């Protein structure tokens, strides 16, 4: 097998982390997207309105 060792931080839960994780429902097909008015992508767009 591969020789390995654990670092400081192993097993912690950090609320700002960013990893993949196991899907609950395999082979699930989410509902098709459709166009909706008024999409927002950066909060600085809202801040520019009087």
């Amino acid at each position: 097998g591969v020789p390995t060792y654990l670092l400081p931080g192993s097993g912690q839960f950090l609320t700002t982390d960013d990893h993949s994780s196991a899907p609950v429902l395999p082979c699930f097909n989410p509902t098709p997207e459709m166009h909706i008015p008024g999409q927002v992508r950066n909060m600085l767009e809202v801040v520019q309105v009087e």
Partner: peptide
Amino acid sequence: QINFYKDSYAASASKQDFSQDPSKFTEPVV
């Protein structure tokens, strides 16, 4: 970026869409 799961919804967050259009809220007039 590491993902060995079969379903695409399992993946990490998507932090790379820099597109904007303020004018749909700031200038909605003819």
